[PDB]
Amino acid sequence: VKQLEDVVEELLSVNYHLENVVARLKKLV
Amino acid sequence: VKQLEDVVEELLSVNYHLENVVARLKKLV
Amino acid sequence: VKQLEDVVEELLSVNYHLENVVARLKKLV
Amino acid sequence: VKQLEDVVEELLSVNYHLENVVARLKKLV
Ligand code: NA
Ligand code: NA
Ligand code: NA
Ligand code: NA
Ligand code: NA
Ligand code: NA
Ligand code: NA
Ligand code: NA
Numbered sequence: 001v002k003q004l005e006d007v008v009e010e011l012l013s014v015n016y017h018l019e020n021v022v023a024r025l026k027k028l029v
Numbered sequence: 030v031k032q033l034e035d036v037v038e039e040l041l042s043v044n045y046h047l048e049n050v051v052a053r054l055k056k057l058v
Numbered sequence: 059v060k061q062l063e064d065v066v067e068e069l070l071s072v073n074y075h076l077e078n079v080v081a082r083l084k085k086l087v
Numbered sequence: 088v089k090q091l092e093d094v095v096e097e098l099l100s101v102n103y104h105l106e107n108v109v110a111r112l113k114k115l116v
Contacts, residue, residue: 003115004058010108011051014101018047018076021097022040028090029033032086039079043072047105050068057061062116069109076105080098087091 001058004112007108007112007115008051008055008058010104011054014105014108015044015047015051017097018044018101018105021094021101022037022044025040025091025094026037028094029030029037033083036079036083036086039075043076043079046068047072047076050065050072054062054065057065059116066109066113066116069112073102073105073109076102080095080102083098084095087088087095
């Protein structure tokens with residue numbers, strides 16, 4: 001688990017970070 | 030543009046799809 | 059596990075699919 | 088454009104970062 005919950009942490013951040021870049025793209029475009 | 034807005038469409042879907050898989054992972058884990 | 063390996067499957071596909079949309083964006087842009 | 092190529096930069100990094108977290112998950116799991 002302890003390794004798994006650290007992957008989950010990094011996935012949460014990657015996912016938030018993609019959603020902010022996609023919102024920025026969508027108003028650029 | 031017309032090519033750009035189709036990339037934006039696919040990014041929106043990829044991003045939603047990642048958020049649902051991450052929510053599922055986070056309650057599995 | 060069986061639930062975990064199905065999340066892993068979906069993540070693999072989401073990740074491939076993002077890499078193809080990013081390659082397409084990068085040559086559009 | 089200059090705004091677009093900065094989105095592209097951030098997408099490249101998000102995509103690399105997801106692929107490393109997915110590779111780590113897949114060998115955890
Ligand atoms: Na932590
Ligand atoms: Na940003
Ligand atoms: Na459409
Ligand atoms: Na799903
Ligand atoms: Na399968
Ligand atoms: Na595509
Ligand atoms: Na730069
Ligand atoms: Na990492």
